């Protein structure tokens, strides 16, 4: 009993998936804000009802369901036809009850980034935007077979990733997409160090004062890899769209 959000690439604009971004975001129901920030659900254990299943079809029909974690927005697997997909990493509860009534198959390697750069997707050579999404769709599809090829699932679950997972969790990348919707672009060392360094903006967020001063600044990057130091809230407030809730200092 989760909950659903729809995407489809046919007749996509730029309006239609910003529009979708903030569907998710809602769906994830997060719980409270820190600094005014929507605040992520620190806890939710049953598979039951702690997902949403992101429904992406392309123009020719074809359809993937991504499960994404409603704490984290965290993708863990998908379904494809009859067959479901987990991340090596995806934990047990997940595993067993996620996408019942499929063919279930456990992939060889992590969802994590460095995890899909094993099986060759890297995020500074991998293509975003609408055609590399209907294309990402287009070989989750085709691959739902026994034999599928790992570098294919890689690099479409890395465009999902960043177009759905990343996308919602920053407005920042959100709108890098947003106004180059129907071209190619490969994502720069500013939106890279974003998606990095979330945990440790939500944690230093979290814990500072009305004042907004974090207790450690967090680095950042320009597009050309100049470095930049984050020491308060309203530095990156208009960057971010959800907080996580991180406990101890991440590091
Ligand atoms: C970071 O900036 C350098 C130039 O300073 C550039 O060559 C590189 O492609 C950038 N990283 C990415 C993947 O955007
Ligand atoms: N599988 C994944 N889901 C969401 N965000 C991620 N960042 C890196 N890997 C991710």
């Not at 998936?17 to 129901?29: A, S, T």
């Amino acid at each position: 009993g989760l909950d659903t959000v729809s995407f489809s690439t046919k007749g996509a604009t730029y309006i239609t998936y910003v529009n979708f971004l903030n569907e998710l975001r809602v769906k994830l129901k997060p719980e409270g804000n820190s600094h005014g920030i929507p605040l992520l659900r620190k806890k939710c254990d049953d598979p039951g009802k702690c997902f949403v299943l992101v429904a992406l079809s392309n123009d020719n029909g074809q359809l993937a369901e991504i499960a994404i974690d409603v704490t984290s927005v965290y993708v863990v697997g998908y379904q494809v036809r009859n067959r479901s997909y987990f991340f090596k990493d995806a934990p047990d509860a997940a595993y067993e009850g996620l996408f019942k009534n499929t063919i279930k198959t456990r992939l060889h390697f992590g969802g994590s980034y460095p995890s899909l750069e094993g099986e060759k997707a890297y995020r500074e050579t991998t293509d975003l935007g609408i055609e590399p999404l209907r294309i990402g769709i287009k070989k989750l599809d085709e691959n739902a077979i026994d034999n599928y090829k790992p570098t294919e699932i890689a690099s479409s679950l890395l465009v999902v990733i960043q177009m759905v997972s990343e996308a919602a969790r920053f407005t920042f990348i959100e709108n890098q997409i947003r106004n180059n919707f129907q071209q190619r672009i490969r994502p720069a060392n500013n939106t890279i160090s974003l998606e990095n360094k979330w945990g440790k903006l939500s944690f230093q967020i979290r814990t500072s004062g009305a004042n907004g001063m974090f207790s450690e600044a967090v680095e950042l990057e320009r597009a050309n890899g100049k470095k930049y130091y984050v020491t308060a809230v309203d530095q990156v407030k208009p960057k971010i769209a959800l907080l996580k809730f991180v406990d101890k200092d991440p590091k």
